[PDB]
Scaffold this active site. Structure first.
Site, mmCIF file in Angstrom:
data_model
loop_
_atom_site.group_PDB
_atom_site.id
_atom_site.type_symbol
_atom_site.label_atom_id
_atom_site.label_comp_id
_atom_site.label_asym_id
_atom_site.label_seq_id
_atom_site.Cartn_x
_atom_site.Cartn_y
_atom_site.Cartn_z
ATOM 1 N N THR A 157 0.862 -1.225 0.000
ATOM 2 C CA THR A 157 0.000 0.000 0.000
ATOM 3 C C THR A 157 0.878 1.247 0.000
ATOM 4 O O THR A 157 1.891 1.298 0.698
ATOM 5 C CB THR A 157 -0.957 0.022 1.220
ATOM 6 O OG1 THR A 157 -1.906 -1.041 1.095
ATOM 7 C CG2 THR A 157 -1.733 1.345 1.334
ATOM 8 N N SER A 158 0.489 2.233 -0.802
ATOM 9 C CA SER A 158 1.135 3.534 -0.812
ATOM 10 C C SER A 158 0.030 4.556 -0.717
ATOM 11 O O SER A 158 -0.827 4.632 -1.592
ATOM 12 C CB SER A 158 1.938 3.743 -2.090
ATOM 13 O OG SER A 158 2.819 2.660 -2.306
#
Ligand SMILES: *[C@@H](CS(C)(=O)=O)[C@H](Cc1ccc(CN)cc1)NC(=O)[C@H](COC)NC(=O)[C@H](CC(C)C)NC(=O)c1cnc(C)s1
Ligand SMILES: [Cl-]
Ligand SMILES: [Mg+2]
Ligand SMILES: [Mg+2]
Ligand SMILES: [Mg+2]
Ligand SMILES: [Mg+2]
Lengths: 241, 231, 243, 196, 226, 244, 204, 250
Positions: free
Chosen positions: D1-2
Site C-alpha cells: 500500500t502507498s
C-alpha cells in the site's frame, strides 16, 4: 383511583395517562402543518417568542434528525428534545448496522414502538409530544409520517397538529377534494412553502411576519430549515399576488 | 402531611419534609460549639449520658492528622460520614501526597448527603457536623447540615439550645478571631460560648469534650482530667 | 386527585405537578442573573448574609465547568452542585472523545436531557434549581437558562430566584437601550446594579455580591471570577445607582 | 500500500494506489483506499483491511451522529475519534490511517495515526509499505502552499515511485481533492504514471 | 471450491462448483454452494462449509425480519454490512469466504467478503482454492456491457477452469442469474461435465452371501394397541 | 415511589390465609368441572368444556386435557394460559429426569416439582399466583396407577377419585357414594360421565362439550396406553353408558 | 489425542428402492484395548434412525439429547419428527457448539412417512449437511467405506439385495481398520416394517 | 432511574376476577370488527380500515399482517399493541423454530408462542395486558388449514368461523347460519364480505376494507425460480380492485 396515575386499564378499557399526555401536546399553543410537493415535503410551524430576553434563534420545534429526515414536534420542549436525541441516535445506528439511510416511515414506526412501550410498562411515562417526520424517501418519494403518545402512527398526504388542527385539516381536505390528487402539483419547493403558508393564513385567519413562522423543507438527499430572510422572501411573494 | 412519606416528594410549597425531619433530629441532639482564630480551630462538645450508670456519648471524631469533626444527632450517621471523610482524606494522601483541603472536604460531604435526598428508598442523614481543620490556607471551620448545605464560618453552634452559644460568638467575633498563638485562650472562649447553651446542668469533668487543631498542633481530643483545667 | 403526590404522573390538565412544586423551591431561593455581552457573558448572584459569623468571600456559589463555562443557580444549592458535577462529567467525556472543548449549545442539551430524565420516573425527584449558565465557544458567546422541567432556551439576559421580576424588568431595559450590544466591563457594572436592585425582595438581611465572567477580549474566553478592584468598582457603581 | 495526503494553498489532496494483496497474490487490483467519513473529511487506510474498514465505518457513524447534534465536525475532531479507537484497541488492531479534511476556517489539514494510536498533525503525510521508498523523494520535493496542479504532480510522481519499487503497491493511482469548491475524484492509469 | 461472480448489462451472475472435501477425500459430489439470503440476493460460499452455510442462513433470517419490519425489498448492502460485522466480530474463526450478489431498488451489486471482515467491490470476483484458475479466465475474457448469454458463458467457463485445474474443485456447475426487473433464476446443475462412466461389472451379491447371527423385528410405532 | 401501587400478593391475612391463593381458588371454582377416577386396571380423566359454541372447531381443540409424557397426563381447571406455562415446565422436568437417570419420571416427583413452583409464587417475588388446579393421572412401576391434585397454594394430595373446578362439593359427594376399591376402568368411565351429567350447569351433557381420556395398562403385552378421546369416540361412549 | 479416533467405530447408510439401510460395527475401545463388543451406534426416534461415530461419551450424550428434543417435538407437534426436519435439528444442535464441538460423525436415515421418499444424510462434527442420494459413510474407516460403497453400490436395490451390499461394504471396510469391528448390526428400513440383523464377522 | 415495578399489576380480586384482563377485553369490545372464516381449500380474514382522517393514507396502516408465508393475522382493539405483537410473532417464528428446524412453524405452535407472550404480560412485573384479541389464520402440511383466536389472557381457541370486536355478537350469529363444512374459498370470501357489511356504517369498498386469504401456493409471488419444493406463500392480501370485483357479485 390509581388506574389514572399509571398506564393500566380503567374499567372502560382506557389509559388515562395516555389521554392526558395528548393534552400536554397542546401546552405550547403552537400549530404545525405539513404538505407534499412533487419533489419535496414542506413543514411549517408557528413560532412564538413572548419574552424579549429570549434569543429567538434558539427557539425552535423543528429538528434535523438526519440529512434526509426532518421532525417537527407539537408539545413541551424537554420531551421534544428527548424524542429528537433518540431519533437521531436511532437513525445513525440504523445506517451503521444496515448500510443505508433510515427511511422516514421506518423511523416513525421505531419511535411509535418506543412510545407503545411507555403505554404498557408502568415505570416509564409517555412523552407529551406528537412527532411529525418528513423526508423525500428514495423509494416512496415525498413522505409525511406522524407519531403520538399512544404509539399510533400513519402516513399522510398532508397533516396538521396543534390547538387549531381541525381548522387547518378541513382547509387542506377541501383543497385536495378540488385538485383530486395526493400532493401539491408544483415544481419548486419555494412555491410549495408559499402554498403551506397561504393555507395556514386562510385556516387560522392570522397574518404572519418573518419572525412568526418557522419552516422546514425536505428535498432529495437533504432536509433544511429556512432562515428568517428566506421566509421574508416567501411572504413577499404571497403578498404580491 | 401527604408529602412526607419519603424523600423523593416535594410538598406544594417546594419543601422536602423528610429532610426537615432529619434536621429536627439535630435540634434534639446535645449542643456542640465550633470556633477558630487565624492559627487554631477549636471544637467544644457537651456530651450526653443515658443515666448516672452510663458513659457519656462521644461527640468528637478524628478524620486525619489535620482535620476532624463534632456531631449532633444520629451518632451512627456521623460514623458513616466520618468514615467517608477518613477515606477521602486518605485517598488524597496516598494518590496525590496531598492533605485534603477543608473546603473540598465540605464539598464531598454535601454531595454525599445530596444523593440520599433525591433518590427513592434512601433516607437523609440524621446528623449535623462541625468540621474543623488546618490546611494550606490556614484554620477553617465548617457547618454541615444533612440537607447538603455546608457553610464556612468563623464560629457556630448546633444542637439543643445552640442559639445561646451562637449569639455569644456573634458578639465575641472581633475578640476570638484575634486569639493567635494561644490555644488555651481560644478553648476558654469556646468553653465560655458553650456555657451560654446550658440550663440546669453545668460542665463537669466527664461531661465536657474539647478538640483542637492548628499550625503546629495535630488534631487531638481532650476528655476526662485533661479538660479539668478549663472547668 | 392524588396526581401531585408522584413525579412523572400527568394530571388531567397534562401537567406534572411535582415539577411545578420544584419551581416553588427555585422561587424561594436567592436571586441569580446572567447577562450576554458583545464577546462573552457575565454571571452574578445574591448571597444572603444570615449571620456575621459567615466568612466573607468564602462560600462561593458560582461554579466553573471545564475552563470556559460558568454556572450559577437559585433554589436547593446541593441540587445545583449535583447538576454541575454531572455537567463536568459530560464536558470531560465530550473533550475526551472529540478533542475540542464542549460547545455551549451542546453542553446545554447535556444538562437539559439529564434534568428532563428526572421527570420521567416516580423513583426520582425533579431538580429544585433553575440554572443560568453559558460561556464562549468557537461560534461566540452563549447564555442559557435551564428549568426543573428540563426546559431551556438561549437568552440575551436571564434571571431567576426571589427577585426575578425586578431583575427581568432591568434586563429588558438594557436590551432596548443597547441593540448594538453591551461591553464586558459594562455588563459587570450592570450585573452589580441588577443584583442590588433585586435585593429589595430580600431586604431584611444584608447580602454579599459575587460576579463572574467569560469574555473573548477580557479573559481570553476562559471563566474567571471578578475580584479586588474590578469587583469594588462594580459595587461602587451599584451603590451609586440605588441612592 | 502507498498512501499520502498533502495540504496545499486551496485545501488538501489524498492519494493512494489500488493494490490489495494476500501474500504475493493480488486479491484486488482496483481497490479504493480513499474513504469518506464525512462530506469533506476523508481518510487513507493501510494495515489490516478488516480493521481499517471496521474503524472507518465506526468513525463515519460517530461523525454522522456528531453532525446531527453539533453541526459539522472539525478535521481535528475526526482524527481524535480515529485515535480513540486505534489507541484503546491497540492490542487487537493493525491500522495505519491518514486523516485529511477541509474546513473553511482551518483550510486543509492532515493528521497521521500510525500503529501505536498516536496522532501527528503534519503539512503532508505518507504511509503504507511503499512509503519507505519515497521518504527521500517527498522530503526533497514538497513545498508549502503549492497549487492544485503542482500537488497533483507531486502525489503522482511520489506514488509512481512507491508503486515502482513496492510489490505490495500497484494498479491505478486514485486521488481525492478537498477544497471550498467541493470534492473531486481523480484517477491515473499505469500507461500515464509509469513513463514519468 | 471455485466460486465466482461477475456483472453484465442489467444484472449480476454467480457461479460455483459442487464439490465438498475433507482433506483429500470427496465428502459431497453435489452440494449447493450458492446460498439463499433473500429472493433476489444470493451468496456464494468458500472456506469452512458449515460456517459459510450458518452465516448466510443467519443473515438471511435477519434480512427477512428486517424486510418485514421496514416493508421494503432487502438491499445487498444490508446483507453485506451484516455479514461483515458478524465475521469481523469472530476475528476469522468463522472461516467463511463469500461472494454476495443481488438486485434491489438501488440496482445490481457484487461484493466479496473475507473471514476476517474485509469487503471488496468488483465487476468480476472469484474465491476459494480455484479462484486463480477462475480469475485467469475472467481476466482474459471479461468486458463491459456483456449480454446475459455472454455472462452465463463466461461465469460457467470461469467455474470450469477451477473444476478441471483445481483438485479442491470438481463435479458440476451451479449458476444463479439476477437481472433487473425480473425474477432471479437459480440454475442448479447448469453444467454436468463429470458424470461417472458405466461400470464394467455389477457387484450385486447372491442372496445369503453374508453370514447372519440373529434376526429381529424392530418396533418403530407408538403403542401396539389392544 | 412504586410502593404505592404494590398489591402485596404474598402476604398473610390476620386469620393466617394467603389472600391471593384464596381468590385464585374462587376463580377456579367457576371453571369447567374436571373429574379423575382411579381403578385397579387404569385411570379415567373426564372434563367439561366451558364455551359451548357451534362454530368452535372441537377436533383440533384442547382446553382441559394435556399430555405431560407417555405415562402421565393432566386435567386443567382455571386459566388455560397459566396452565400451559406450567405444563411446558412439567414436560421439560420429565425429559430432564429421563436424560439424567435413563428412566421415566415417577409421578409424585413430577407433581412435587410443579407444586413447588406454585408454592414459590405464594412466598416470594411479588407476583400473582397461577390460577390453576391440576388433576394428575399417571403410571409408574413403583406405585402403579396414581391420581393427584395440586392447587395455587402448591399443596398436593393423592386420590382414588377427585374433582376440581365447578360444583366440586356436589361432585365429590356423588363419587364418594358410588366409588368402590375393586372398581374397573369401564365402570369408572360410567361413573365419571354420570357425575358430570348431574353436576353440570348445562341443560344436557353432549359430546361437543367434553374432553375425555384414559390411561390403561391394557395395551398390547403389558405396556401403558394414554388415550385422548376423539369427538366421535366421546359420542359413542355417551350412547354406550346411556346418557344421550 | 485425536478425540474422533480414541474409541473407534463406523456407520454406513444406503438408499434402495422404497427403502433405506443403516449399519454399524459394535466395537468400543481405548485406543488399542478393546473394551466392549456390544456398543451399538444406531439409535431411533420414532421412524427416524440416527447413527453416530466418534468419541463415545458424545455418542451417548447426543443420543440422550436428541431423544430429549424429539420427545418434546412430538408432544408439541402431535406427530413424529420426519428425517428432513430431524437432519436440520442435528445440524442446528451441532453448530451451536461451534467452538467447543461434539467429536462425532452423525448419519441420519429414514423414510418420510407422508411422501414415502427414502432419505439419508451425513454431517461433519460442526453440522455441515451432506444430503446424498446414494450413500453416507462415517467413522475411523470412512476412507475404506467410501471405497467399498463407491464400487459395490448401484441405485434402486430391493431391500434384501441392499442388505447384502451394505453388509459387505461394512464388513470388508471394518476388517481393514484396527479400531473397527468386533461385531456389526444392519437395519433394513421400509415404510412400515424395520428388520434388524446382527452379522457374523471376524473377532480381531 | 430505576424500574421498581417488579410486582404484578394484574391480581385476583375477591370474586376471582383478574380485573386488568377483563378491562383489556372491554378495550377489545370497543375496537373495530374483524372476522375469520375457514373453508375446505382456504381461510379468509377481514376487517374494516377505520381511517382516523381522510388526509391519512390508510394503505400505509396494515391491520392484516403476514407473520409467515403461510400464516396471517388480524386484530380488534388497540393498534399499537397489535403492531408490536406482530413484530415479536415474526421474530419468535425464526428464533424458537426456523433457526432450529429449518422450516416455518405450524399455525398452532406460532399461536402458542404469541399466546405465551400475552400471558406473560398478564403475570410479569410492572406491565399491563395487551389490549387486543388476535385472529390468526394459517396453513401447514400436517394440520391443513386452521383459524385461531387469541385473547388478552393468553387463551386461544380454534374456530371454524368467528368475529371479534364491535359487532361480534351479531356477526357470530350471521356466520352460524351461513357456515357449512363444504364451503369453497370464494364462498367464504363472499360470506365474509356480507358479514362485514352489517358492522360498517360509512363507505364499503376495496379502499375501506382490508381482506387477506390463506389459500393455494403462489409461485408468482415467490420472487425466484429453480427450487421445486419451494412453491410460494399461501398468504395473500387481496387488492383494492379484487375486493371491488366481488362486491359487484354481492
Ligand atoms: C470449498 C472450500 S476451499 C477448498 O477452501 O476453497 C468448499 C466450500 C463449500 C461451501 C459450502 C458447502 C455446503 N453448503 C460445501 C462446500 N468447502 C469444503 O470443501 C470444506 C473444506 O474446505 C477447507 N469442507 C468442510 O468444511 C467439511 C464438511 C463437508 C465435508 C460437509 N468439514 C471438514 O472438513 C471439517 C470441519 N471440521 C473439521 C475438524 S473437518
Ligand atoms: Cl422497534
Ligand atoms: Mg407508563
Ligand atoms: Mg508495483
Ligand atoms: Mg478390525
Ligand atoms: Mg483386535
Amino acid at each position: 383511583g390509581y388506574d389514572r396515575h399509571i398506564t393500566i386499564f380503567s374499567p372502560e378499557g382506557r389509559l388515562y395517562q395516555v389521554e392526558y399526555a395528548f393534552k400536554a401536546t397542546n401546552q405550547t399553543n403552537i400549530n404545525s402543518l405539513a404538505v407534499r410537493g412533487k419533489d419535496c415535503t414542506v413543514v411549517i410551524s408557528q413560532k412564538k417568542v413572548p419574552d424579549k430576553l429570549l434569543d429567538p434563534t434558539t427557539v425552535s420545534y423543528i429538528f434535523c434528525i438526519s440529512r434526509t429526515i426532518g421532525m417537527v414536534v407539537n408539545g413541551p420542549i424537554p420531551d421534544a428534545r428527548n424524542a429528537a436525541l433518540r431519533a437521531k441516535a436511532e437513525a445513525a445506528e440504523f445506517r451503521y448496522k444496515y448500510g443505508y439511510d433510515m427511511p422516514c416511515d421506518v423511523l416513525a414506526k421505531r419511535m411509535a414502538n418506543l412510545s407503545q412501550i411507555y403505554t404498557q410498562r408502568a415505570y416509564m411515562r409517555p412523552l407529551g409530544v406528537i412527532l411529525t417526520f418528513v423526508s423525500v424517501d428514495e423509494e416512496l418519494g415525498p413522505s409525511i409520517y406522524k407519531t403520538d403518545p399512544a404509539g399510533y402512527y400513519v402516513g399522510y398526504k398532508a397533516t396538521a397538529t396543534g390547538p387549531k388542527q381541525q381548522e387547518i385539516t378541513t382547509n387542506l381536505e377541501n383543497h385536495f377534494k378540488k385538485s383530486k390528487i395526493d400532493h401539491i402539483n408544483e415544481e419548486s419547493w419555494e412555491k410549495v412553502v408559499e402554498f403551506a403558508i397561504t393555507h395556514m393564513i386562510d385556516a387560522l385567519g392570522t397574518e404572519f411576519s418573518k419572525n412568526d413562522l418557522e419552516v422546514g423543507v425536505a428535498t432529495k438527499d437533504k432536509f433544511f430549515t429556512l432562515s428568517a430572510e428566506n421566509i421574508e422572501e416567501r411572504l413577499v411573494a404571497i403578498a404580491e399576488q | 402531611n401527604n408529602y412526607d412519606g419519603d424523600t423523593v416528594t416535594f410538598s406544594p410549597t417546594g419543601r422536602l419534609f423528610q429532610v426537615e425531619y432529619a434536621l429536627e433530629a439535630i435540634k434534639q441532639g446535645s449542643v456542640t460549639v465550633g470556633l477558630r482564630s487565624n492559627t487554631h480551630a477549636v471544637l467544644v462538645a457537651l456530651k450526653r449520658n443515658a443515666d448516672e450508670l452510663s458513659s457519656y456519648q462521644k461527640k468528637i471524631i478524628k478524620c486525619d492528622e489535620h482535620m476532624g469533626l463534632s456531631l449532633a444527632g444520629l451518632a451512627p450517621d456521623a460514623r458513616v460520614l466520618s468514615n467517608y471523610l477518613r477515606q477521602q482524606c486518605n485517598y488524597s494522601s496516598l494518590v496525590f501526597n496531598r492533605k485534603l483541603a477543608v473546603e473540598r472536604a465540605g464539598h464531598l460531604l454535601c454531595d454525599k448527603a445530596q444523593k440520599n435526598t433525591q433518590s427513592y428508598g434512601g433516607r437523609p442523614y440524621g446528623v449535623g457536623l462541625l468540621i474543623i481543620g488546618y490546611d494550606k490556607s490556614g484554620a477553617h471551620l465548617l457547618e454541615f447540615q444533612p440537607s447538603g448545605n455546608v457553610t464556612e464560618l468563623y464560629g457556630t453552634a448546633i444542637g439543643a439550645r445552640s442559639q445561646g452559644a451562637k449569639t455569644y460568638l456573634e458578639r465575641t467575633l472581633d475578640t476570638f478571631i484575634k486569639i493567635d498563638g494561644n490555644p488555651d485562650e481560644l478553648i476558654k472562649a469556646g468553653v465560655e460560648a458553650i456555657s451560654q447553651s446550658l440550663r440546669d446542668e453545668s460542665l463537669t469533668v466527664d461531661n465536657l469534650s474539647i478538640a483542637i487543631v492548628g499550625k503546629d498542633t495535630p488534631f487531638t481530643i481532650y476528655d476526662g482530667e485533661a479538660v479539668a483545667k478549663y472547668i | 386527585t392524588g396526581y401531585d403526590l408522584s413525579n412523572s404522573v400527568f394530571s388531567p390538565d397534562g401537567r406534572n405537578f411535582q415539577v411545578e412544586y420544584a419551581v416553588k423551591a427555585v422561587e424561594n431561593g436567592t436571586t441569580s442573573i446572567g447577562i450576554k455581552c458583545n464577546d462573552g457573558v457575565v454571571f452574578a448572584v445574591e448571597k444572603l448574609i444570615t449571620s456575621k459569623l459567615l466568612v466573607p468571600q468564602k462560600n462561593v456559589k458560582i461554579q466553573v465547568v471545564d475552563r470556559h463555562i460558568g454556572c450559577v443557580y437559585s433554589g436547593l444549592i446541593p441540587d445545583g452542585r449535583h447538576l454541575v458535577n454531572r455537567g463536568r462529567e459530560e464536558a470531560a467525556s465530550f473533550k475526551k472523545l472529540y478533542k475540542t472543548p464542549i460547545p455551549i449549545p451542546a453542553f446545554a442539551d447535556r444538562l437539559g436531557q439529564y434534568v428532563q430524565a428526572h421527570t420521567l420516573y416516580n423513583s426520582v425527584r425533579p431538580f429544585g434549581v433553575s440554572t443560568i449558565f453559558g460561556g464562549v465557544d468557537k461560534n461566540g458567546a452563549h447564555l442559557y437558562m435551564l428549568e426543573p422541567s428540563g426546559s431551556y432556551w438561549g437568552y440575551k439576559g436571564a434571571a431567576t430566584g426571589k427577585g426575578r421580576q425586578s431583575a427581568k424588568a432591568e434586563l429588558e431595559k438594557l436590551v432596548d437601550h443597547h441593540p448594538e450590544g453591551l461591553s464586558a466591563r459594562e455588563a459587570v457594572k450592570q450585573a452589580a446594579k441588577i443584583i442590588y436592585l433585586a435585593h429589595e425582595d430580600n431586604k431584611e438581611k444584608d447580602f454579599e455580591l459575587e460576579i463572574s465572567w467569560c469574555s473573548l477580549s477580557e479573559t481570553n474566553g476562559l471563566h474567571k471570577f471578578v475580584k479586588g478592584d474590578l469587583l469594588q468598582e462594580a459595587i461602587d457603581f451599584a451603590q451609586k445607582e440605588i441612592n | 500500500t502507498s498512501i499520502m495526503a498533502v495540504t496545499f494553498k486551496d485545501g488538501v489532496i489524498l492519494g493512494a494506489d489500488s493494490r490489495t494483496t494476500t501474500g504475493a497474490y493480488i486479491a484486488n487490483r482496483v481497490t479504493d483506499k480513499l474513504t469518506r467519513v464525512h462530506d469533506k473529511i476523508w481518510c487513507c487506510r493501510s494495515g489490516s483491511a478488516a480493521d481499517t474498514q471496521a474503524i472507518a465505518d465506526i468513525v463515519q457513524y460517530h461523525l454522522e451522529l456528531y453532525t446531527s447534534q453539533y453541526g459539522t465536525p472539525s478535521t481535528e475532531t475526526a482524527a481524535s475519534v480515529f485515535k480513540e479507537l486505534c489507541y484503546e484497541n491497540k492490542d487487537n488492531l493493525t491500522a495505519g490511517i491518514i486523516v485529511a479534511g477541509y474546513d473553511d476556517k482551518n483550510k486543509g489539514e492532515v493528521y497521521t495515526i500510525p500503529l501505536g494510536g498516536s496522532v501527528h498533525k503534519l503539512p503532508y503525510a505518507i504511509a503504507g509499505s511503499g512509503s519507505t521508498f519515497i521518504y527521500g523523494y517527498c522530503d526533497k520535493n514538497f513545498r508549502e502552499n503549492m497549487s492544485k496542479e503542482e500537488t497533483v504532480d507531486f502525489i503522482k510522481h511520489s506514488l509512481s515511485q512507491a508503486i515502482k519499487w513496492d510489490g505490495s503497491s500497484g494498479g491505478v493511482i486514485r486521488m481525492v481533492v478537498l477544497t471550498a469548491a467541493g470534492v473531486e475524484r481523480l484517477i491515473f492509469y499505469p500507461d500515464e504514471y509509469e513513463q514519468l | 471450491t471455485t466460486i465466482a461472480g461477475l456483472v453484465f448489462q442489467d444484472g449480476v451472475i454467480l457461479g460455483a462448483d459442487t464439490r465438498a472435501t475433507n482433506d483429500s477425500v470427496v465428502a459431497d459430489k453435489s452440494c449447493e454452494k450458492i446460498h439463499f439470503i433473500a429472493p433476489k440476493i444470493y451468496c456464494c460460499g468458500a472456506g469452512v462449509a458449515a460456517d459459510a452455510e450458518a452465516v448466510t442462513q443467519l443473515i438471511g433470517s435477519n434480512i427477512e425480519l428486517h424486510s418485514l419490519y421496514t416493508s421494503r425489498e432487502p438491499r445487498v448492502v444490508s446483507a453485506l454490512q451484516m455479514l461483515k460485522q458478524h465475521l469481523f466480530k469472530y476475528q476469522g474463526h468463522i472461516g467463511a469466504y463469500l461472494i454476495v450478489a443481488g438486485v434491489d431498488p438501488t440496482g445490481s451489486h457484487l461484493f466479496s467478503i473475507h473471514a476476517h471482515g474485509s469487503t471488496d467491490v468488483g465487476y468480476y470476483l472469484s474465491l476459494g482454492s480455484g479462484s486463480l484458475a477462475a480469475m485467469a479466465v475472467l481476466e482474459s475474457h471479461w468486458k463491459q456491457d456483456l449480454t446475459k448469454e455472454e455472462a452465463i458463458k463466461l461465469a460457467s467457463d470461469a467455474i470450469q477452469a477451477g473444476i478441471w485445474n483445481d483438485l479442491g474443485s470438481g463435479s458440476n456447475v451451479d449458476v444463479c442469474v439476477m437481472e433487473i426487473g425480473k425474477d432471479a433464476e437459480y440454475l442448479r446443475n447448469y453444467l454436468t461435465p463429470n458424470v461417472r462412466e458405466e461400470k464394467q461389472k455389477s457387484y450385486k451379491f447372491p442372496r445369503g452371501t453374508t453370514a447372519v447371527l440373529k434376526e429381529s423385528i424392530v418396533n418403530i410405532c407408538d403403542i401396539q394397541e389392544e | 415511589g412504586s410502593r404505592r401501587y404494590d398489591s402485596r400478593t404474598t402476604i398473610f391475612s390476620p386469620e393466617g390465609r394467603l389472600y391471593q391463593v384464596e381468590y385464585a381458588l374462587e376463580s377456579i371454582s367457576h371453571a369447567g368441572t374436571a373429574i379423575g377416577i382411579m381403578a385397579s386396571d387404569g385411570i379415567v380423566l373426564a372434563a367439561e368444556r366451558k364455551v359451548t359454541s357451534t362454530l368452535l372447531e372441537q377436533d383440533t381443540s384442547t382446553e382441559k386435557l394435556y399430555k405431560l409424557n407417555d405415562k402421565i397426563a393432566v386435567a386443567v381447571a382455571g386459566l388455560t394460559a397459566d396452565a400451559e406455562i406450567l405444563i411446558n415446565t412439567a414436560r421439560i422436568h420429565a425429559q430432564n429426569y429421563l436424560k439424567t437417570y435413563n428412566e421415566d419420571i415417577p409421578v409424585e416427583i413430577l407433581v412435587r416439582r410443579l407444586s413447588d413452583i406454585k408454592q414459590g409464587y405464594t412466598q416470594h417475588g411479588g407476583l400473582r399466583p397461577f390460577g390453576v388446579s391440576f388433576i394428575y393421572a399417571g403410571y409408574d412401576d413403583r406405585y402403579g396407577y396414581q391420581l393427584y391434585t395440586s392447587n395455587p397454594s402448591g399443596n398436593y394430595t393423592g386420590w382414588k377419585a377427585i374433582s376440581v373446578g365447578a360444583n366440586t362439593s356436589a361432585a365429590q359427594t356423588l363419587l364418594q357414594m358410588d366409588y368402590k376399591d375393586d372398581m374397573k376402568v369401564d365402570d369408572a368411565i360410567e361413573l365419571a360421565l354420570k357425575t358430570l351429567s348431574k353436576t353440570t350447569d348445562s341443560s344436557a351433557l353432549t359430546y361437543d362439550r367434553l374432553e375425555f381420556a384414559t390411561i390403561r395398562k391394557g395395551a398390547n403385552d403389558g405396556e401403558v396406553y394414554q388415550k385422548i378421546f376423539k369427538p366421535q369416540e366421546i359420542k359413542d361412549i355417551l350412547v354406550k353408558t346411556g346418557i344421550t | 489425542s485425536d478425540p474422533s479416533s480414541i474409541n473407534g467405530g463406523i456407520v454406513v447408510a444406503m438408499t434402495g428402492k422404497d427403502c433405506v439401510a443403516i449399519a454399524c460395527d459394535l466395537r468400543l475401545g481405548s485406543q488399542s484395548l478393546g473394551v466392549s463388543n456390544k456398543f451399538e451406534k444406531i439409535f431411533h426416534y420414532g421412524h427416524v434412525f440416527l447413527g453416530i461415530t466418534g468419541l463415545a461419551t458424545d455418542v451417548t450424550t447426543l443420543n440422550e439429547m436428541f431423544r430429549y428434543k424429539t420427545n418434546l417435538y412430538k408432544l408439541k407437534e402431535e406427530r413424529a419428527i420426519e428425517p428432513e426436519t430431524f437432519t436440520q435439528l442435528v445440524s442446528s444442535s451441532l453448530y451451536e457448539r461451534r467452538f467447543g464441538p461434539y467429536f462425532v460423525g452423525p448419519v441420519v436415515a429414514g423414510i418420510n412417512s407422508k411422501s414415502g421418499k427414502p432419505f439419508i444424510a451425513g454431517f461433519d462434527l460442526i453440522g455441515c449437511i451432506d444430503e446424498a442420494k446414494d450413500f453416507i459413510v462415517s467413522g475411523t474407516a470412512s476412507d475404506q467405506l467410501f471405497g467399498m460403497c463407491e464400487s459395490l453400490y448401484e441405485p434402486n436395490l430391493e431391500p434384501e439385495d441392499l442388505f447384502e451390499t451394505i453388509s459387505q461394504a461394512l464388513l470388508n471396510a471394518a476388517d481393514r481398520d484396527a479400531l473397527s469391528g468386533w461385531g456389526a448390526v444392519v437395519y433394513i428400513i421400509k415404510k412400515d416394517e424395520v428388520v434388524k440383523r446382527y452379522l457374523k464377522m471376524r473377532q480381531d | 432511574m430505576t424500574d421498581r415495578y417488579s410486582f404484578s399489576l394484574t391480581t385476583f380480586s375477591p370474586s376471582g376476577k383478574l380485573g386488568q384482563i377483563d378491562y383489556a377485553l372491554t378495550a377489545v369490545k370497543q375496537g373495530v370488527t374483524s372476522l375469520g372464516i375457514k373453508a375446505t381449500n382456504g381461510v379468509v380474514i377481514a376487517t374494516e380500515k377505520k381511517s382516523s382522517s381522510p388526509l391519512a393514507m390508510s394503505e400505509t396502516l396494515s391491520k392484516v399482517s403476514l407473520l409467515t408465508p403461510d400464516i396471517g393475522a388480524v386484530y380488534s382493539g388497540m393498534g399499537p399493541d397489535y403492531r408490536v405483537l406482530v413484530d415479536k410473532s415474526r421474530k419468535v417464528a425464526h428464533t424458537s423454530y426456523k433457526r432450529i428446524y429449518g422450516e416455518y412453524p405450524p399455525t398452532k405452535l406460532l399461536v402458542s408462542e404469541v399466546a405465551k407472550i400475552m400471558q406473560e404480560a398478564t403475570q410479569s412485573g410492572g406491565v399491563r395486558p395487551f389490549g387486543v384479541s388476535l385472529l390468526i389464520a394459517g396453513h401447514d402440511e400436517f394440520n391443513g388449514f386452521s383459524l385461531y383466536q387469541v385473547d388478552p389472557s393468553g387463551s386461544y381457541f380454534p374456530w371454524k368461523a368467528t368475529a371479534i370486536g364491535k359487532g361480534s355478537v351479531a356477526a357470530k350469529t350471521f356466520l352460524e347460519k351461513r357456515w357449512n363444512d363444504e364451503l369453497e374459498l370464494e364462498d367464504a370470501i363472499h360470506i365474509a364480505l356480507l358479514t362485514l357489511k352489517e358492522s360498517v356504517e360509512g363507505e364499503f369498498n376495496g379502499d375501506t376494507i382490508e381482506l387477506a386469504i390463506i389459500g393455494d401456493e403462489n409461485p408468482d409471488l415467490l420472487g425466484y425460480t429453480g427450487i421445486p419444493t419451494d412453491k410460494g406463500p399461501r398468504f395473500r392480501k387481496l387488492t383494492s380492485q379484487e375486493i371491488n370485483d366481488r362486491l359487484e357479485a354481492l
